[PDB]
């Protein structure tokens, strides 16, 4: 029941002592299904620091402090495990390898693309897969629609302009225009589809009056002749 | 398949036009399509059915 | 911790970079073909393995370029204000 | 070749989501 | 002329004999000895 | 984790003899 987020809700409301999640076997163990060993760098670790520092004053009504302090031993162990492992890494480096740049070029580029979830080229009908396309399109629109409207830039080239306290430099909206061309073209997609429907079905529905090798074919020139045969009059 | 298209007519013509040129160089065999329509055991069976129809009608 | 790179740094360090990004690409292909969005814990933990390899080559081996290809800009928040002329209904 | 350009400076990081820019962190 | 969903296409979705025959007939129509 | 330029990502990214031998005879 989001035990790692209810502590964030109690911290953001500035009242993590008046309730303090009411830690028993019925409440502290129901939202956990021992605390579940949180994942973030410090966004869920600084919460447990303040949660222990607040529950230092009751210190006996909440039995889950032993479960929190056991993971405090595991955090200090795995940091100490890594700090010995980082030291055994930095000695196990061969003094000559000469890491190749054009593979590190392919390693800096492909890592940067795989970070923010885009398709990486290697260089090393069917409505089932139609929903899997439109679920990534609607994924992008709902990600563009959570950015703040007051987004501004800062290039490294403004120091030649000597911007004063109130100067209104002209490079402030070089990220804001690109975020609204992207958000609005992802809504006019079925609009260019209707034009491309009206474009393809207007240039290809004839297909034998402009294309020369098709209007100079035997079967088409005979058929266009055959449909223009006027009826024979009887007597 | 009961109808023909402009795609169907040109594919019928081009496949038939390329196979006759593929016989002069003889890079195709075309022996299965010869002897099955010759069928010389049928041709004598055609003859023997023609031979008995002499005997039956005389 | 590390648990694999100390054994591998005695030989080449770049082969685990090549073999794991293919696993990152294959798991991402399995993520798009499952209509899921969040990355798995198996490839996120595998992601921090790759960044630790290239960092120590820049740290200790000190690669001869470490190429700088930056956009030389970064998004920042700017202030906002309503107008001071009052509303007319 | 006309290609739609990749905007990595706007894209939030997916694997970590803690090394994003401070305007893109909420 | 705008590739909008073209990346989502690329995200989710990743003869010789008769030419030399037409070359050979071109060689037969040069020498009448063939 | 610094972003890379888009114009750099777009920058890094028997049948003969079967008929000839038939053409020499006939």
Q: Is C45 helix (H, G, I), strand (E, B) or coil?
A: helix
Q: Which residues lie below 8 Å from residue A109, measured CB to CB, with a gap of 6+? A: F4, F8, F9, F12
**Resolution to one decimal, Å:** 7.6
- Interchain contact F21–D (C-beta under 8 A): no
E20 close to F16: Cβ distance less than 8 angstroms? yes
Phi-psi region of A2 (alpha: psi -120 to 50; beta: other; left: phi over 0): left
Q: How many CB pairs under 8 A join B and E?
A: 9
Angstrom distance (rounded) from CA C67 to CA A103: 12
Task: Using alpha carbons, select from A58, A60, A61, A35 the residue that is nearest to residue A48.
Answer: A35
Candidates A73, D9, A94, A98; CA nearest to F4 is D9
* A183 CB-side CA count, 13 A: 14
CA–CA separation, C75 and B17 (whole Å): 66
Residue C53 CA neighbour count, 13 Å, CB half: 28
Q: Which of C30, E2, C33 is nearest to A133 (CA)?
A: C33
Q: In chain F, after which residues is the C-to-N distance over 2.5 Å, breaking the chain? A: 13
Of F22, C68, A140, A8, the closest CA to residue E7 belongs to: A140
- Show Cβ contacts of residue B37 under 8 Å, excluding neighbours closer than 6 positions: none
Chain D neighbours, 3+ Cβ pairs < 8 A: A, C, E, F
Phi, psi angle pair for C65, to nearest 5°: -110, -60
- Give the separation between CA A116 and CA D14, rounded to whole angstroms: 5
Q: Is C1 on the interface with A (CB under 8 A)?
A: yes
With contacts defined as CB-CB under 8 Å, which chain D residues touch A115?
13-16
Separation between Cα atoms, residue A115 and residue A182, nearest integer Å: 20
F and A make contact (3+ CB pairs below 8 Å): yes
Interchain contact, E20 vs F16, CB within 8 Å: yes
Helix (H) or strand (E) holding C77: strand C76-77
> How crowded is the C-beta side of A16, counted as CA atoms within 13 Å?
23
- The Cα–Cα gap between F24 and F26 comes to 6
Chain E neighbors (3+ CB pairs < 8 Å):
A, B, C, D, F
Structurally, how many domains does chain A consist of? 1
Q: What are phi and psi of A155, to 5 degrees?
A: -80, 165
CA nearest to A140, candidates A163, A116, A123 = A116
Select the residue from E11, E13, E14 to test the C interface by mutation, using most C Cβ atoms within 10 A. E11
Tell whether the torsion through CA atoms of A194, A197, A200 and A205 is positive or negative.
negative
The answer, for A89 touching chain C at a CB cutoff of 8 Å, is yes
d(CA A27, CA C85) in angstroms, rounded, equals 54
Q: How far is CA B39 from the centre of its chain?
A: 10
- Chain B nearest CA to F17, separation (Å): 11
Annotate A213-230 with DSSP letters as a single string: HHHTSHHHHHHHHHTTPP
Residue A23: which residues within 8 A CB-CB, separation 6 or more? A61, A62, A63, A64
- What tokens appear for A164 in the block? 């004063």
CA terminus-to-terminus distance, chain D: 37
Do D13 and A182 make contact, defined as CB atoms within 8 angstroms? no
Helix, strand, coil shares, percent, chain C, to 5: 50, 5, 50
Cα angle A111, A114, A117; round to 5: 155
Note whether F18 and E17 are within 8 A (CB). yes
The upper half-sphere exposure of residue C7, i.e. CA atoms within 13 Å in the direction of its Cβ, equals 4
Q: What is the SS3 string spanning chain A?
A: CCHHHHHHHHHHCCCCCCCHHHCCCCCCCCCCCCCCCCCCCCCCCHHHHHHHHHCCCCCCCCCCHHHHHHHHHHHHHHHHHHHHHHHHHHHCCCCCCCCCHHHHHHHHHHHHHHHCCCCCCCCCCCCHHHHHHHHHHHHHHHHHCCCCCCEECCECCHHHCCCCCCCCCCCCCCCCCHHHHHHHHCCCHHHHHHHHHHHHHHHCCCCCCCCHHHHCCHHHHHHHHHCCCCCCCCC
Q: How many CB pairs under 8 A join C and F?
A: 9
Contacts of D12 in chain F (CB under 8 A): none
Rounded to a whole number of angstroms, the CA Rg of chain E reads: 23
- Chain C residues lying within 8 Å of E12, measured CB to CB: 32-33
Q: How many CA atoms lie within 13 A of D14 on its CB side?
A: 24
Q: Which residues of A12-50 are buried (b: 16+ CB within 10 A; e: fewer)?
A: eeeebeeebbebeeeebeebeeebeebeeeeebeebbee
Q: How far is CA A74 from the centre of its chain?
A: 31
Give the Cα separation of E14 and A120 in Å (integer): 10
* Residue A155 bridge partners (DSSP): C73
Cβ A171 vs Cβ A155: under 8 Å: yes
Identify the domain containing residue A216 by its residue range. 1-235
Of the candidates A18, A107, A3, A94, the residue with the CA atom closest to the CA atom of residue A54: A18
User: Pick from F4, A110, A98: which is nearest to C19 by CA?
Assistant: A110
Residues of E in contact with C29 (CB under 8 A): 14
Q: How far apart are CA A224 and CA A226, in angstroms?
A: 5
Contacts of A220 in chain B (CB under 8 A): 6
CA F20 vs CA B14, B21, B29, E18: distances in Å: 22, 14, 17, 12
CA D26 distance to own-chain centroid: 14
Q: Helix crossing, B6-24 with E16-28: angle to 10°?
A: 60
Closest C-alpha to C15, from A89, A103, A91: A103
Q: Report the sign of the C-alpha dihedral through residues A120, A121, A125, A126, in that order.
A: negative
**Among the partner residues D9, D15, D23, nearest to C47 by beta-carbon distance:** D15
Structure tokens at F8: 């750099």
Token match 């000469």: residue? A98
Q: Which residues pair with C73 in a beta bridge?
A: A155
Instruction: Return the residue matching tokens 């629109």.
Output: A141
- Whether A153 and A171 have beta carbons less than 8 Å apart is answered as yes
On whether any CB of chain D is under 8 Å from the CB of F15, the answer is no
Across the A:B interface, residue pairs with CB atoms under 8 Å apart total: 6
d(CA F26, CA F18): 14
Q: Are residues E18 and F13 in contact, defined by beta-carbon separation less than 8 angstroms?
A: no
Regarding beta strands A151-152 and C76-77, do their DSSP bridges make them parallel or antiparallel, or are they unpaired? antiparallel
Q: Which of D3, D5, D9 sits opposite F3 (nearest CB)?
A: D9
CA D12 to chain CA centroid, Å, is 4
Q: Do the Cβ atoms of D9 and E11 come closer than 8 Å?
A: no
Number of H helices, E strands in chain E: 2, 0
C-alpha dist (Å) from residue A203 to A146, A197, A198, A206, F17: 41, 10, 9, 7, 43
Calpha distance B28→A144 (Å, rounded): 61
Give yes or no for F6 touching D (CB within 8 A): yes
CA distance B34 to A127: 48
C-alpha span between B43 and B39 (Å, rounded) = 6
Distance from C-alpha of A144 to C-alpha of D22, rounded to nearest angstrom: 16
Distance between CA A126 and CA C16 in Å, rounded? 37
Contact criterion met (CB below 8 Å) for E12 and A132: yes
Task: Tell me the C-alpha distance between C47 and C50, whole Å.
Answer: 5
Residue A204 CA to residue A194 CA, distance in Å, equals 15
Distance CA A106, CA A99 (A): 12
Residues 6+ apart with CB under 8 A from C8: C15, C16
Cβ proximity of C9 and A94 under 8 Å: yes
Q: Using an 8 Å Cβ cutoff, are A52 and A65 in contact?
A: yes
Alpha carbons C8 and A93: distance in angstroms, whole number: 9
Query: How far is Cα B3 from Cα A217, in angstroms, rounded to an integer?
Result: 19
């Amino acid at each position: 029941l989001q035990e790692q987020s209810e502590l964030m809700s109690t911290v953001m409301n500035n009242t993590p002592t008046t309730v303090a999640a009411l830690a028993a076997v019925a409440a502290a163990s129901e939202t956990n299904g021992t605390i579940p060993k949180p994942r973030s760098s410090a966004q869920l670790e600084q919460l447990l620091y303040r949660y222990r520092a607040i529950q230092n004053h009751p210190k006996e009504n909440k039995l889950e402090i032993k479960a929190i302090e056991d993971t405090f031993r595991n955090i200090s162990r795995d940091q100490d495990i890594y700090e010995t492992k980082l030291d055994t890494l930095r000695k196990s480096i061969d003094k000559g390898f000469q890491y190749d740049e054009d593979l590190l070029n392919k390693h800096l580029v492909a890592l940067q693309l795989l970070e923010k979830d885009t398709d990486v080229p290697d260089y090393f009908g069917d409505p089932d897969t139609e929903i899997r396309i439109s679920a990534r399109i609607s994924n992008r629109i709902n990600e563009l629609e959570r950015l703040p409207a007051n987004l501004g830039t800062y290039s490294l080239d403004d120091c030649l302009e000597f911007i004063t306290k109130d100067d209104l430099s002209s490079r402030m909206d070089t990220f804001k225009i690109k975020a609204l061309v992207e958000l609005k073209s992802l809504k006019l997609l079925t609009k260019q589809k209707s034009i491309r429907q009206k474009l393809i079905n207007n240039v290809a529905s004839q297909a034998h009056h402009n294309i020369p090798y098709l209007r100079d074919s035997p079967f088409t020139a005979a058929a266009q002749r055959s449909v223009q045969i006027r009826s024979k009059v009887i007597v | 398949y009961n109808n023909v298209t402009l795609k169907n007519l040109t594919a019928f013509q081009l496949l038939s036009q390329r196979e006759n040129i593929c016989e002069l160089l003889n890079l195709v065999e075309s022996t299965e399509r010869h002897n099955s329509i010759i069928n010389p055991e049928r041709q004598r069976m055609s003859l023997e059915e023609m031979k008995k129809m002499l005997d039956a009608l005389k | 911790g590390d648990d694999e790179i100390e054994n591998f740094r005695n030989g080449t360090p770049d082969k685990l970079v090549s073999d794991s990004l293919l696993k990152l690409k294959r798991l991402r292909k399995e993520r798009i073909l499952n209509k899921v969005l969040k990355p798995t814990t198996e490839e996120r933990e595998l992601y921090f393995k790759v960044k630790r390899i290239l960092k120590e080559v820049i740290l200790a081996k000190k690669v001869s370029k470490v190429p700088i290809n930056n956009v030389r800009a970064f998004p920042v928040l700017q202030t906002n204000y309503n107008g001071s002329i009052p509303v007319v209904r | 070749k006309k290609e739609f350009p990749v905007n990595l400076t706007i894209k939030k990081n997916v694997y970590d989501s803690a090394q994003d820019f401070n305007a893109l962190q909420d | 002329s705008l590739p909008i969903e073209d990346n989502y296409i690329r995200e989710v979705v990743g003869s010789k004999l008769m030419e030399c025959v037409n070359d050979a007939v071109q060689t037969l129509l040069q020498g009448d000895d063939k």
